[PDB]
Design an enzyme around this catalytic site. Sequence first.
Site, PDB file in Angstrom:
ATOM      1  N   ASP A   1       7.777  15.795  20.361  1.00 22.46           N
ATOM      2  CA  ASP A   1       8.562  16.280  21.494  1.00 22.46           C
ATOM      3  C   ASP A   1       8.103  17.668  21.912  1.00 22.46           C
ATOM      4  O   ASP A   1       8.503  18.651  21.289  1.00 22.46           O
ATOM      5  CB  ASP A   1      10.053  16.308  21.120  1.00 22.46           C
ATOM      6  CG  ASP A   1      10.942  16.786  22.244  1.00 22.46           C
ATOM      7  OD1 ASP A   1      10.466  16.833  23.386  1.00 22.46           O
ATOM      8  OD2 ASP A   1      12.132  17.087  21.983  1.00 22.46           O
TER       9      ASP A   1
ATOM     10  N   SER B   1       3.216  22.781  39.206  1.00 19.83           N
ATOM     11  CA  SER B   1       2.447  21.803  39.939  1.00 19.83           C
ATOM     12  C   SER B   1       2.235  22.284  41.371  1.00 19.83           C
ATOM     13  O   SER B   1       3.090  22.960  41.944  1.00 19.83           O
ATOM     14  CB  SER B   1       3.157  20.453  39.913  1.00 19.83           C
ATOM     15  OG  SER B   1       2.538  19.538  40.798  1.00 19.83           O
TER      16      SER B   1
END
Length: 330
Positions: free
Chosen positions: A35, A199
């Site tokens: 994770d 992004s």
Amino acid sequence: STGSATTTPIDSLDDAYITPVQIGTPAQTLNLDFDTGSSDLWVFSSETTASEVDGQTIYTPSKSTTAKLLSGATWSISYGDGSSSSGDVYTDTVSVGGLTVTGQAVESAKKVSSSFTEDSTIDGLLGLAFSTLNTVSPTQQKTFFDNAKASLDSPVFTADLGYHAPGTYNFGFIDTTAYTGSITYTAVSTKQGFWEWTSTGYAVGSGTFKSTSIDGIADTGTTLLYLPATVVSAYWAQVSGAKSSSSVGGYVFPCSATLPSFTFGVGSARIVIPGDYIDFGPISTGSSSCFGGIQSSAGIGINIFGDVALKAAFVVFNGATTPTLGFASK
């Protein structure tokens, strides 16, 4: 040193991925959920409330000759999906894919929430975010990656998740056969303890690319792709019949649809998520309404590039002094 371990979807929807981890001496192999959005390595154990164990493999510290109680230390964690666990702490030898850390904090669960109990395939979590998020008190503990870093050939690990198929976590090296083209690196902020990056925008299907900064985290422990409501609305608007359902808990779409792809930007590069990756199947057994793999982050408080996005790429988690993230197509 290096390590290399196969990671395997827990079910037919890629709801999560499990990776075998050796703990203790003799080895006890548990299948952990790697994770990159948390920083605790915790396991089902011989200390876990018996009613809360249902099929998991447990770590039994008393059977490990290298286990040592970390006296006084406790841990307690709550995840973004509302699940939680807590307990005490041992140190023991932990190996992933041939890579061995001695004195790793292994957090032994005394309590786990129902979603963990109900998932027989996940024996615990292995956190790979920054150690600043580790919940051990009163002495915060380092992640497996943090502990291994200095021994690694290169201070990196890579996530190569499969679509409906096994993939790979590598530690300490970049497998140049595992991706196509080049790796595009992008800046990381560690200020929130996550692999947080920006992004450069998105496209829906064969649509034009929209340049826009989307701050989010690379999180292997989250199944879906959570993005701003504007983005998610633009995606689902291209699927006839798709709608947001508050009763179901997000966007649903007709199971008869052909989903469009979704592209996200990494600097000047582009990662394409095939439409099939975004199908998470009937909302309930036999339903002809299907659950979307792209959902709104509104009310999460952060955008999350979860498995739906990450499995479309070869992802480098670069833990150099100045960490960065790298993405390649594959």
